[PDB]
Design a protein around this ligand. Structure first.
Ligand SMILES: Nc1ncnc2c1ncn2[C@@H]1O[C@H](CO)[C@@H](O)[C@H]1O
Ligand SMILES: [Mg+2]
Length: 387
């Protein structure tokens, strides 16, 4: 009779929704079969597109396709971070009372939205994905945020849930949700130190938590808000642009279609390289009707991104220093984020911890949502105590 509650990982680049029922979690696929959904919203003269449909039409509608709203949420327009990020976005960000708003063309009008309004559209889609699986309306949810988010950012995320028609049970930290997915808070009495290594599409976060009798304390947070999978895609694209120049004596960089098609093929070859030692790249008529059929080895990809992968250890060292803990004092190392599938990244972290095994038995893309779904199921319990 009681509807299930959902756990939502409201990500910078992608979001994910889960439900915990009968001792098991289901990470829910959307109608296109994807277990993760782009945190994108596109506006046209006739439609508001959310998720895959928005991301899939970004190439020709860059001014009216919004993404990265999580980088603006709960911040001031005057913030240096906001002014820097704006230089990289094709959509307009406006100033309304020292608060940023995204401005687009939508259904015949110029319209401006607060970041919480864009995130409420992403949350609306995640709610619908869950309702398609459950077969009934969903209202209760736990939403996750980065551990470094302040009160303004947490409140703006709750407001996004409220606008989406969701009752927000709690806002919980992303690394806490990942620890809950592994049941790390169920180890009973005694302090447990957990390091969460979160490398995603566009961000990198390291968090150290101490858990005692199910109570969490964030001991340190470090990372780089501008390091992730997209930076590795960028390195591959540069390598291929150079290769094309070498073979055909043409620079393909100015044709946006060629660069986009190359970037899309690069990202897929990158995924293959996590499972195979080689990946072929085949593109028909990339530039001036020339087919670009080539290959790349895992060793070459690792060389291309080597400095980026190595740089992930600096925040790990910093977090350990800030938490006042030695490497040997960390009980569990947990991998989160799609980019942690890269073998070289796992090797570097393992070597840093002198050969320690890494927790990766839960899909890295889904661990945060999984933990949020477990917490949501706990929070809606309303049993009266037996005599
Ligand atoms: N198997 C994989 N190997 C490497 N990167 C991956 C893999 N799966 C997903 N990613 C990356 O994780 C990020 C979040 O989806 C993206 O940058 C994506 O390219
Ligand atoms: Mg994330």
């Amino acid at each position: 009779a009681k509807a299930a509650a959902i756990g939502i990982d409201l990500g910078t680049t992608y979001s994910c929704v889960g439900v915990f029922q009968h001792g098991k979690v289901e990470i829910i696929a959307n109608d296109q079969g994807n277990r993760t959904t782009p945190s994108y919203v596109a506006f046209t003269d006739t439609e508001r597109l959310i998720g895959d449909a928005a991301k899939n039409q970004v190439a020709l509608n860059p001014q009216n396709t919004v993404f990265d709203a999580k980088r603006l949420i709960g911040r001031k327009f005057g913030d240096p971070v906001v002014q820097s990020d704006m230089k990289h976005w094709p959509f307009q960000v406006i100033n309304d009372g020292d608060k940023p708003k995204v401005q687009v063309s939508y259904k015949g009008e110029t319209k401006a939205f607060y970041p919480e309004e864009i995130s409420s559209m992403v949350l609306t889609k995640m709610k619908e994905i869950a309702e398609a699986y459950l077969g009934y309306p969903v209202t209760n949810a736990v939403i996750t945020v980065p551990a470094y988010f302040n009160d303004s950012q947490r409140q703006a995320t709750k407001d996004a849930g409220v606008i989406a028609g969701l009752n927000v049970l709690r806002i919980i930290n992303e690394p806490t949700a990942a620890a809950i997915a592994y049941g790390l808070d169920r180890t009973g009495k005694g302090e447990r130190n957990v390091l969460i290594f979160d490398l995603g599409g566009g961000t990198f976060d390291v968090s150290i938590l101490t858990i005692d009798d199910g109570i969490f304390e964030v001991k340190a947070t470090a990372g780089d808000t501008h390091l992730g999978g997209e930076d590795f895609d960028n390195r591959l694209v540069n390598h291929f642009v150079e290769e094309f120049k070498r073979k055909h004596k043409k620079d393909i960089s100015q044709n946006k279609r060629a660069v986009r098609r190359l970037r899309t093929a690069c990202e897929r070859a990158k995924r293959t390289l996590s499972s195979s030692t080689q990946a072929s790249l085949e593109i028909d008529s990339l530039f001036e009707g020339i087919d670009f059929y080539t290959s790349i080895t895992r060793a070459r990809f690792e060389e291309l991104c080597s400095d980026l992968f190595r740089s992930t250890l600096e925040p790990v060292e910093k977090a350990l220093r800030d938490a006042k803990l030695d490497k040997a004092q960390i009980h569990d190392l947990v991998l989160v984020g799609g980019s942690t599938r890269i073998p070289k990244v796992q090797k570097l972290l393992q070597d840093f911890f002198n050969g320690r095994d890494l927790n990766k038995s839960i899909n890295p893309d889904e661990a945060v949502a999984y933990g949020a779904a477990v917490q949501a199921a706990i929070l809606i319990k309303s049993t009266r105590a037996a005599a």
